[PDB]
Amino acid sequence: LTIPRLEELYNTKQGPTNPMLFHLIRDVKQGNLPPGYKITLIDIGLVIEYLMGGTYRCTYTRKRFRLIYNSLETKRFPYPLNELLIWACLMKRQVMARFLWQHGEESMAKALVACKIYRSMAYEAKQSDLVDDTSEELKQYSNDFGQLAVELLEQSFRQDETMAMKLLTYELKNWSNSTCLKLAVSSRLRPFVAHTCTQMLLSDMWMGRLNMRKNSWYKVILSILVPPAILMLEYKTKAEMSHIPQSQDAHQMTMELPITRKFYAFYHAPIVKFWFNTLAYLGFLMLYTFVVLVKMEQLPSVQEWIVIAYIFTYAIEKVREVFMSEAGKISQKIKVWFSDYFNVSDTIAIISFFVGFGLRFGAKWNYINAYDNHVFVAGRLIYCLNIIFWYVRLLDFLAVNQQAGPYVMMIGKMVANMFYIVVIMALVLLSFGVPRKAILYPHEEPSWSLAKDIVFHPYWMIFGEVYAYEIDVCANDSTLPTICGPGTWLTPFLQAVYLFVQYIIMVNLLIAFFNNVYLQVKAISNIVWKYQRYHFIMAYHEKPVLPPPLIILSHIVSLGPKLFLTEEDQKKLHDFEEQCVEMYFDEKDDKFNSGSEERIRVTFERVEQMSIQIKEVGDRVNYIKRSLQSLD
Amino acid sequence: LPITRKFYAFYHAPIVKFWFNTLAYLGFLMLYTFVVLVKMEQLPSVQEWIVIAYIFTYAIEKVREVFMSEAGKISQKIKVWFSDYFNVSDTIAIISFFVGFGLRFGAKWNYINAYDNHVFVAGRLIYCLNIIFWYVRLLDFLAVNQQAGPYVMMIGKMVANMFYIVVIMALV
Amino acid sequence: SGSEERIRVTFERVEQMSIQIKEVGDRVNYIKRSLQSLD
Ligand SMILES: CCCCCCCC/C=C\CCCCCCCC(=O)O[C@@H](COC(=O)CCCCCCCCCCCCCCC)COP(=O)([O-])OCC[N+](C)(C)C
Ligand SMILES: CCCCCCCC/C=C\CCCCCCCC(=O)O[C@@H](COC(=O)CCCCCCCCCCCCCCC)COP(=O)([O-])OCC[N+](C)(C)C
Numbered sequence: 083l084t085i086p087r088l089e090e091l092y093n094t095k096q097g098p099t100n101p102m103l104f105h106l107i108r109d110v111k112q113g114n115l116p117p118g119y120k121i122t123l124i125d126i127g128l129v130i131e132y133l134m135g136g137t138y139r140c141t142y143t144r145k146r147f148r149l150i151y152n153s154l155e156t157k158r159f160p161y162p163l164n165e166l167l168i169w170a171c172l173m174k175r176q177v178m179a180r181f182l183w184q185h186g187e188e189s190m191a192k193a194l195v196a197c198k199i200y201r202s203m204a205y206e207a208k209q210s211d212l213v214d215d216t217s218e219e220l221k222q223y224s225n226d227f228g229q230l231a232v233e234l235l236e237q238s239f240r241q242d243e244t245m246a247m248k249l250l251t252y253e254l255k256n257w258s259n260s261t262c263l264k265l266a267v268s269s270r271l272r273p274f275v276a277h278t279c280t281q282m283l284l285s286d287m288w289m290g291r292l293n294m295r296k297n298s299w300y301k302v303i304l305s306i307l308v309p310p311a312i313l314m315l316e317y318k319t320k321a322e323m324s325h326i327p328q329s330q331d332a333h334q335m336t337m338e339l340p341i342t343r344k345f346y347a348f349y350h351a352p353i354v355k356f357w358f359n360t361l362a363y364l365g366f367l368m369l370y371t372f373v374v375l376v377k378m379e380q381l382p383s384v385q386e387w388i389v390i391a392y393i394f395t396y397a398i399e400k401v402r403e404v405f406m407s408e409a410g411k412i413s414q415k416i417k418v419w420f421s422d423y424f425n426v427s428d429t430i431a432i433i434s435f436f437v438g439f440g441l442r443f444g445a446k447w448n449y450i451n452a453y454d455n456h457v458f459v460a461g462r463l464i465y466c467l468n469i470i471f472w473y474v475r476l477l478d479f480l481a482v483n484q485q486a487g488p489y490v491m492m493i494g495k496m497v498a499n500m501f502y503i504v505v506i507m508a509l510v511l512l513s514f515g516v517p518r519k520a521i522l523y524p525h526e527e528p529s530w531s532l533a534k535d536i537v538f539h540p541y542w543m544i545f546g547e548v549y550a551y552e553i554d555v556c557a558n559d560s561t562l563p564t565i566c567g568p569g570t571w572l573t574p575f576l577q578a579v580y581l582f583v584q585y586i587i588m589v590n591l592l593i594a595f596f597n598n599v600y601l602q603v604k605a606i607s608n609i610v611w612k613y614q615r616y617h618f619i620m621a622y623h624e625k626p627v628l629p630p631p632l633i634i635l636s637h638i639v640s641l642g643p644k645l646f647l648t649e650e651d652q653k654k655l656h657d658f659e660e661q662c663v664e665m666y667f668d669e670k671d672d673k674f675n676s677g678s679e680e681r682i683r684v685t686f687e688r689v690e691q692m693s694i695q696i697k698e699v700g701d702r703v704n705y706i707k708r709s710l711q712s713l714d
Numbered sequence: 715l716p717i718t719r720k721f722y723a724f725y726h727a728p729i730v731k732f733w734f735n736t737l738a739y740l741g742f743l744m745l746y747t748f749v750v751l752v753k754m755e756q757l758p759s760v761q762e763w764i765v766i767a768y769i770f771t772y773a774i775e776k777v778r779e780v781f782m783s784e785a786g787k788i789s790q791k792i793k794v795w796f797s798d799y800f801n802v803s804d805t806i807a808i809i810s811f812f813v814g815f816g817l818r819f820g821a822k823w824n825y826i827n828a829y830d831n832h833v834f835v836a837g838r839l840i841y842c843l844n845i846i847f848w849y850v851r852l853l854d855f856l857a858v859n860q861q862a863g864p865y866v867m868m869i870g871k872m873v874a875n876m877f878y879i880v881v882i883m884a885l886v
Numbered sequence: 887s888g889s890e891e892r893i894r895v896t897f898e899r900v901e902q903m904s905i906q907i908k909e910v911g912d913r914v915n916y917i918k919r920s921l922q923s924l925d
């Protein structure tokens with residue numbers, strides 16, 4: 083495999099081609115395509131970097147290759163089975179891609195690349211206007227390699243858990259210094275991230291140096307409030323921290339416990355940052371609850387100032403998260419941060435607060451007895467509504483637990499699914515409300531109170547209220563005797579039908595909906611919860627040590643983690659990989675050639691043969707004795 | 715494409731006729747909701763006339779659907795059209811309206827302070843009950859969706875199935 | 887007495903008997919070659 087041959091393999095029409103490769107060559111060159119165009123590997127590299135996304139950089143687009151390519155051993159490649167795997171996948175040649183995948187090294191990595199490349203071509207095929215979409219074909223090819231990567235990880239995990247966790251985090255050096263666990267996140271390949279092995283790793287990254295089988299959360303919270311109790315905690319040895327990726331400054335300190343080291347290990351663990359923010363967030367709500375319930379004067383109280391400080395500094399910390407994320411382009415930094423329910427809510431919560439502060443604070447205190455100054459009122463009322471956002475953000479903290487977190491994810495999924503049942507209920511409501519109002523209140527002029535009256539009491543009927551003494555307004559126990567008139571005897575009949583429909587049909591249908599959909603939503607929600615632990619835990623490695631009142635100093639002073647292996651440990655790891663791939667194919671053949679469906683049929687074939695042979699004996703064996711009848 | 719062709723393709727697509735009827739049907743209910751909640755005088759309002767026009771012309775369009783169906787014999791044209799829940803309901807809704815219009819409109823306005831004229835009252839009260847039919851027809855439009863439509867069909871099937879449990883409850 | 891166990895010991899014997907009939911099929915040819923040659 084040389085460069086000129088590998089050119090020809092992309093530039094050939096004498097075989098099954100991908101019609102959409104050329105449609106991708108255009109977009110990376112932005113318009114230019116002569117009819118006699120011979121594809122070049124510089125142009126293939128730009129397709130790959132486009133498809134793989136992020137900050138991926140192919141070896142075709144580097145200084146070393148661009149020179150030797152223009153110049154033209156050296157035209158060879160060191161790893162040609164990688165160059166052909168990409169070819170077979172860009173050309174939509176799955177049977178060739180599977181074959182070439184089995185040959186070479188780094189099998190689990192190559193499978194996660196292939197999953198990514200097909201997934202990205204499937205998306206462009208949706209977004210493009212062609213005769214055959216081919217996208218369910220490519221989406222099928224992506225999930226085939228994705229299933230292989232998962233099956234190899236389970237194989238490695240059953241052999242050695244610690245070495246399997248190392249496999250998720252070593253750099254690859256032929257795949258743009260990337261990581262198998264990063265490639266799977268890029269493809270949203272969830273059974274791999276929801277797998278026991280990498281959940282075990284995220285839980286060890288959560289600890290840091292802290293050994294949290296001996297310790298308990300009683301003593302971490304204590305040690306945050308009682309700093310000198312940091313010294314009486316059990317930590318981990320460098321040997322126990324070997325499969326865990328670390329920062330530069332971390333490994334230095336682990337390499338050299340000294341007193342100052344034992345503090346550093348504590349305040350830079352993600353678990354400690356969590357509780358150290360959590361406690362500050364709860365102290366925040368207590369005050370903002372005190373401020374909103376207690377009378378507010380012209381000048382803010384000491385409680386209110388502390389609240390303004392937190393939200394101001396909290397907002398600053400959200401800006402840096404945007405402009406320091408894994409995506410390298412702004413528009414990607416934006417869309418991904420707004421892909422989280424509670425980051426959207428914090429954006430509204432922050433913006434709405436300072437509107438309210440502006441009115442509350444920038445209001446001209448014409449003394450009148452406040453709540454005669456209506457600009458002050460609007461400011462305070464925005465606070466009273468904004469605090470709802472900050473209670474609901476507690477569900478973000480609570481979802482860190484294994485039991486609570488999936489239920490928090492179910493609540494969103496079920497609101498989406500119960501939508502149309504609730505639309506029908508809202509129709510039954512108006513079907514009742516409009517006649518009830520029209521019959522009982524005929525002498526009315528137009529007003530926006532009509533819009534409340536057709537909707538108000540019918541809604542409250544769903545929730546256990548009957549308005550017993552308002553039914554039959556002409557009765558003696560009625561509370562609406564001025565409303566008795568012609569045609570009011572109809573409204574009890576109407577309401578009897580209304581509640582029959584809402585409870586006996588529609589509430590119980592909704593109960594029946596949930597009972598019959600609970601399991602598969604719960605199952606999806608557990609996998610989704612596990613996939614998102616990654617984005618959650620990997621953020622705390624980048625967050626500062628101080629929480630959002632005192633973080634301001636960490637910002638001013640300020641103005642990823644990597645897995646390190648010595649060479650013998652890289653050697654032991656590449657051997658672990660090869661061995662576990664061999665075991666995988668072997669056990670696959672054995673299970674196949676040990677099943678009844680496979681033994682019945684190879685028996686079926688031999689018996690068919692042996693039938694022919696005994697006949698091929700039966701004719702001949704007659705023909706033996708004919709001598710001892712004739713020769714004799 | 716030619717300009718006039720590109721309009722023809724639009725106004726003769728079934729999706730476009732649907733939303734173009736749907737929006738007119740919603741504008742219809744808004745007015746008939748305004749008419750039924752706001753005080754009614756001797757002479758109909760501009761809102762009420764528009765409502766009478768829609769139901770009159772709506773009725774005409776239902777007649778042609780009957781006499782232009784795939785069945786070629788009248789008695790088959792009839793039975794098949796009445797095989798739909800909401801076409802039966804529209805038949806009652808249309809007939810009941812013009813009874814109410816007759817009383818509301820053909821009533822001798824002996825001035826007395828209306829709601830002393832009891833023929834006017836019956837007319838108005840039929841409107842207030844007839845509008846229920848026209849909210850429930852919105853379930854016919856909503857059943858065009860894949861998620862909502864089956865639930866609309868379940869509601870009918872379950873009323874039929876829960877019948878005897880409800881008879882026992884009525885006995886208790 | 888189970889099918890998974892009877893299918894497989896059947897699977898093994900049939901593999902053996904295939905070898906034997908062949909170990910007959912070569913030999914049984916080699917019998918009649920007398921009554922073509924000896925005769
Ligand atoms: C927010 C970000 C940082 C996070 C930490 C924040 C904590 C900061 C801590 C303390 C700061 C408190 C302010 C001091 C005010 C003293 C004023 C005084 O004289 O005495 C006051 C005592 O104070 C009160 O009554 C105020 C209510 C206390 C609420 C405490 C909740 C949070 C505690 C944290 C728990 C966290 C535990 C972890 C979670 C489980 C008397 O009341 P008053 O206020 O004068 O009443 C108004 C009367 N007037 C206007 C007529 C005069
Ligand atoms: C990652 C994404 C999330 C984060 C995004 C960050 C978004 C930031 C959030 C929100 C910014 C936008 C909200 C609008 C601002 C207030 C407007 C207002 O009402 O002004 C008022 C006056 O103003 C004052 O009296 C001055 C006080 C306001 C300055 C402090 C808040 C805004 C500045 C930024 C601070 C936060 C910066 C945070 C740094 C990041 C006008 O009302 P008034 O004068 O009372 O009118 C009548 C007066 N009269 C009665 C005398 C006639």
Ligand SMILES: CCCCCCCC/C=C\CCCCCCCC(=O)O[C@@H](COC(=O)CCCCCCCCCCCCCCC)COP(=O)([O-])OCC[N+](C)(C)C
Pocket residue numbers: 294299303353360476479480481482483484485
């Ligand atoms: C001066 C006062 C100071 C002290 C007071 C303050 C004390 C602190 C406050 C509360 C006590 C909480 C203790 C729970 C910890 C148990 C251990 C555990 O398993 O943790 C899990 C919980 O992980 C979380 O993140 C839980 C959520 C945090 C608190 C949420 C506040 C809002 C809840 C209230 C809203 C309703 C309110 C209505 C009623 C008022 C995570 O672990 P796991 O995934 O199961 O796996 C084990 C992993 N690990 C152990 C290595 C982490």
Ligand SMILES: CCCCCCCC/C=C\CCCCCCCC(=O)O[C@@H](COC(=O)CCCCCCCCCCCCCCC)COP(=O)([O-])OCC[N+](C)(C)C
Pocket residue numbers: 423470474477490491492493494495496497498499
């Ligand atoms: C008034 C007349 C009646 C109307 C009222 C209506 C009220 C409604 C109000 C509020 C409900 C709004 C929730 C919308 C969520 C939609 C997003 C979603 O589907 O899930 C996403 C977020 O996943 C999560 O985990 C989100 C968790 C948020 C919980 C918020 C609860 C707020 C409680 C407030 C308490 C305050 C109460 C007191 C206030 C004073 C996950 O996305 P997905 O997985 O792709 O989802 C597809 C799902 N599917 C494929 C299964 C279909």
Ligand SMILES: CCCCCCCC/C=C\CCCCCCCC(=O)O[C@@H](COC(=O)CCCCCCCCCCCCCCC)COP(=O)([O-])OCC[N+](C)(C)C
Pocket residue numbers: 566567568569570832833835836837839840
């Ligand atoms: C269902 C089987 C048949 C059963 C038996 C027969 C029942 C069936 C038919 C007929 C019964 C209708 C007449 C009842 C009159 C008695 C009340 C009365 O005296 O006057 C009434 C006035 O009312 C009117 O002026 C007209 C009322 C009827 C018009 C609306 C028809 C609604 C039902 C049509 C569709 C139904 C179909 C539903 C099918 C499921 C009430 O007013 P008042 O009492 O005079 O109040 C005076 C107050 N003041 C002193 C302040 C001024």
Ligand SMILES: CCCCCCCC/C=C\CCCCCCCC(=O)O[C@@H](COC(=O)CCCCCCCCCCCCCCC)COP(=O)([O-])OCC[N+](C)(C)C
Pocket residue numbers: 528737738739740741742743744745748759760761764765768
């Ligand atoms: C139905 C079949 C066709 C379908 C379209 C129908 C639409 C036709 C459109 C417009 C026609 C409106 C009639 C004009 C009357 C003007 C009178 C006047 O001077 O001003 C009036 C303004 O008008 C009102 O207040 C009437 C209420 C408006 C209801 C609009 C709902 C439908 C809008 C369509 C939305 C569709 C959107 C799509 C759906 C999402 C003042 O009030 P009034 O009435 O004088 O009050 C009685 C007072 N008096 C008796 C004491 C004097």
Ligand SMILES: CCCCCCCC/C=C\CCCCCCCC(=O)O[C@@H](COC(=O)CCCCCCCCCCCCCCC)COP(=O)([O-])OCC[N+](C)(C)C
Pocket residue numbers: 770773774776777780804805808809810812813814815816817818819820821822833
């Ligand atoms: C596909 C199947 C579905 C479609 C089927 C179609 C079915 C059509 C639907 C219904 C038709 C049958 C309903 C009955 C008619 C009203 C009777 C009535 O009350 O008259 C009243 C008077 O009448 C008037 O004052 C004249 C106004 C009525 C004419 C307009 C409606 C009927 C004509 C057809 C228009 C729609 C045609 C639509 C074209 C298709 C009598 O009441 P009164 O005079 O007040 O009595 C006392 C008076 N006093 C106080 C002075 C003593």
Ligand SMILES: CCCCCCCC/C=C\CCCCCCCC(=O)O[C@@H](COC(=O)CCCCCCCCCCCCCCC)COP(=O)([O-])OCC[N+](C)(C)C
Pocket residue numbers: 805806809810813826829830831832833836
């Ligand atoms: C297919 C069928 C089509 C034809 C239907 C034909 C039906 C047409 C029927 C009848 C026409 C009647 C007109 C004349 C009435 C004579 C009485 C009178 O004048 O005065 C009396 C009116 O008292 C009433 O109750 C009148 C209203 C009852 C009508 C009920 C209709 C039911 C429709 C059901 C819907 C069916 C829908 C079915 C759809 C499938 C007394 O009142 P007053 O003197 O005016 O008041 C002065 C009182 N003061 C002392 C307070 C001042």
Ligand SMILES: CCCCCCCC/C=C\CCCCCCCC(=O)O[C@@H](COC(=O)CCCCCCCCCCCCCCC)COP(=O)([O-])OCC[N+](C)(C)C
Pocket residue numbers: 505506508509729736852855856857858859860861
């Ligand atoms: C000036 C003002 C103008 C604008 C305002 C008016 C805006 C319009 C009004 C409402 C917004 C509706 C938007 C839905 C469309 C989504 C696309 C879709 O999938 O369509 C589906 C919905 O098909 C239907 O037919 C839906 C029902 C129509 C509206 C029903 C009104 C009654 C509901 C209210 C009752 C409760 C009321 C209580 C609360 C008030 C059909 O498609 P599908 O089978 O899923 O497959 C896709 C096929 N397709 C896309 C090719 C079609």
Ligand SMILES: CCCCCCCC/C=C\CCCCCCCC(=O)O[C@@H](COC(=O)CCCCCCCCCCCCCCC)COP(=O)([O-])OCC[N+](C)(C)C
Pocket residue numbers: 510513514517575576577578579580582583799846850853866867868869870871872873874875
């Ligand atoms: C008061 C004391 C208590 C009594 C009150 C009782 C009240 C009852 C009132 C109303 C309920 C009446 C519905 C009857 C439907 C029967 C037809 C049917 O079975 O389905 C058919 C139509 O299929 C559909 O999809 C029909 C959908 C119509 C929904 C109407 C809801 C009205 C809501 C109104 C809201 C207004 C509320 C406010 C008003 C002011 C399909 O036929 P099928 O598939 O062959 O069915 C066989 C089923 N099986 C084989 C499974 C067995």
Ligand SMILES: C[C@@H]1CC[C@@]2(OC1)O[C@H]1C[C@H]3[C@@H]4CC=C5C[C@@H](OCCC(CO)CO)CC[C@]5(C)[C@H]4CC[C@]3(C)[C@H]1[C@@H]2C
Pocket residue numbers: 512528529530532533740743744745747748
């Ligand atoms: C499908 C859905 C059902 C039907 C429906 O929605 C769609 O159709 C809408 C039409 C609405 C009315 C249109 C115009 C006005 C005039 C306005 O006049 C100000 C007077 C005074 C205020 O103090 C200042 O002078 C008052 C409100 C009113 C009557 C609307 C009420 C709500 C109605 C009935 C709505 C109803 C819920």
Ligand SMILES: CC(C)CCC[C@@H](C)[C@H]1CC[C@H]2[C@@H]3CC=C4C[C@@H](O)CC[C@]4(C)[C@H]3CC[C@]12C
Pocket residue numbers: 427467470471474
């Ligand atoms: C219509 C306007 C003018 C009046 C007030 C509207 C009501 C419905 C508004 C005001 C405050 C709002 C709440 C503010 C905050 C949140 C938290 C969020 O996670 C879910 C929605 C939720 C719970 C909102 C629901 C709708 C809400 C209750």
Ligand SMILES: [NH3+]C1(Cc2ccc(Cl)cc2)CCN(c2ncnc3[nH]ccc23)CC1
Pocket residue numbers: 421422423424478479481482483487610611614615618619
């Ligand atoms: N952050 C959440 C919850 C969570 C999960 C795990 C831990 Cl360890 C802690 C908290 C809550 C928002 N969510 C989300 N928001 C919006 N749309 C979505 N689509 C998929 C997931 C989400 C993603 C998880």
Ligand SMILES: [NH3+]C1(Cc2ccc(Cl)cc2)CCN(c2ncnc3[nH]ccc23)CC1
Pocket residue numbers: 797798799800854857858863
């Ligand atoms: N028209 C409906 C609902 C519907 C279905 C599909 C679309 Cl795309 C739009 C609306 C509502 C009445 N129905 C019906 N009515 C009475 N008896 C029956 N037996 C079987 C069906 C029906 C037939 C479907």
Ligand SMILES: [Ca+2]
Pocket residue numbers: 545546547
């Ligand atoms: Ca109750």
